Amino acid sequence: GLVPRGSHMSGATEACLPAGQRKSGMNINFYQYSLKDSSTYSNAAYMAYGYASKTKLGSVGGQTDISIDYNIPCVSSSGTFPCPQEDSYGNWGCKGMGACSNSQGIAYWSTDLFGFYTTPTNVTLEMTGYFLPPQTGSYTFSFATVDDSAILSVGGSIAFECCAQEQPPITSTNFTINGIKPWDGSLPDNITGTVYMYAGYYYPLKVVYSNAVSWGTLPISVELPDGTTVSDNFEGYVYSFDDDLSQSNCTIPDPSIH
Numbered sequence: 001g002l003v004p005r006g007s008h009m010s011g012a013t014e015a016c017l018p019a020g021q022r023k024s025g026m027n028i029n030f031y032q033y034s035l036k037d038s039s040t041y042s043n044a045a046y047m048a049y050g051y052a053s054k055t056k057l058g059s060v061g062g063q064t065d066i067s068i069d070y071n072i073p074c075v076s077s078s079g080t081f082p083c084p085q086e087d088s089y090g091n092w093g094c095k096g097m098g099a100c101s102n103s104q105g106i107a108y109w110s111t112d113l114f115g116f117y118t119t120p121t122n123v124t125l126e127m128t129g130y131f132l133p134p135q136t137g138s139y140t141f142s143f144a145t146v147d148d149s150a151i152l153s154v155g156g157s158i159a160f161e162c163c164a165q166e167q168p169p170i171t172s173t174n175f176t177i178n179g180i181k182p183w184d185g186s187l188p189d190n191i192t193g194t195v196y197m198y199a200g201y202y203y204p205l206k207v208v209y210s211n212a213v214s215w216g217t218l219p220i221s222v223e224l225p226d227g228t229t230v231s232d233n234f235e236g237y238v239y240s241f242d243d244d245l246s247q248s249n250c251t252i253p254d255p256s257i258h
């Protein structure tokens with residue numbers, strides 16, 4: 001055949017070719033989330049778009065280094081230092097610091113989330129941008145763990161619409177990774193999702209992350225078609241573009257035949 005036949009049942013992931021000035025990194029938007037609310041973020045509609053109905057706190061652009069690793073303070077005999085969760089013990093102390101005098105269960109203010117001053121104990125954030133595959137093939141995105149609730153979505157009309165990165169969130173709940181905190185309690189370290197991508201196309205990427213209490217954690221990785229893994233620092237892979245709703249040709253519904 002002179003041409004490829006295309007993915008079966010138009011199953012290729014939609015991608016984009018935005019024509020404007022590319023910027024390195026993802027945009028991060030921050031939204032209010034209530035301390036100790038362990039229910040709101042267990043709903044798919046909230047995690048897909050509902051988060052943006054709460055007050056927007058602010059934003060930071062140009063972020064390439066995207067994993068979350070937030071540790072609450074331990075107010076200790078020798079001063080105040082962040083405590084790795086695995087080093088916390090008793091009621092409570094932090095290994096190497098002694099007993100901590102402060103509550104685990106209050107809000108704490110910090111810039112650790114992308115330099116933005118907020119409460120990482122209780123917040124929801126939305127990361128948007130475009131993933132640029134350097135290689136054609138299967139990419140496997142993963143969260144190593146999820147504390148508390150998160151989704152990852154890849155593709156036009158799944159993450160967001162082409163050339164419209166800055167618009168209000170779309171309603172798609174067809175998540176690439178569903179790390180939504182279960183009602184039942186529990187969940188494993190499905191957690192991963194696979195997308196077949198064609199080199200040189202821009203794939204919309206959305207990550208929505210929430211925490212209700214204390215520690216927050218979301219280690220983000222992707223396994224490339226060559227079997228190597230990129231973790232935390234996605235520089236060279238993620239980009240933003242200012243909205244251009246007028247760019248008629250921006251959406252590529254089927255990169256497998258374009």
Ligand SMILES: [Cl-]
Nearest residue numbers: 073080081082
């Ligand atoms: Cl601290």
Ligand SMILES: [Cl-]
Nearest residue numbers: 095096097098
């Ligand atoms: Cl100790």
Ligand SMILES: [Gd]
Nearest residue numbers: 065066067232
């Ligand atoms: Gd990092």
Ligand SMILES: [Gd]
Nearest residue numbers: 068069070112
């Ligand atoms: Gd951190």
Ligand SMILES: [Gd]
Nearest residue numbers: 069084085086
């Ligand atoms: Gd940690």
Ligand SMILES: [Gd]
Nearest residue numbers: 112113114115
């Ligand atoms: Gd940080």
Ligand SMILES: [Gd]
Nearest residue numbers: 156157158161
């Ligand atoms: Gd669409």
Ligand SMILES: [Gd]
Nearest residue numbers: 213214215216
């Ligand atoms: Gd947490």
Ligand SMILES: [Gd]
Nearest residue numbers: 140223227228
């Ligand atoms: Gd592999």
Ligand SMILES: [Gd]
Nearest residue numbers: 166241242243
């Ligand atoms: Gd803009």
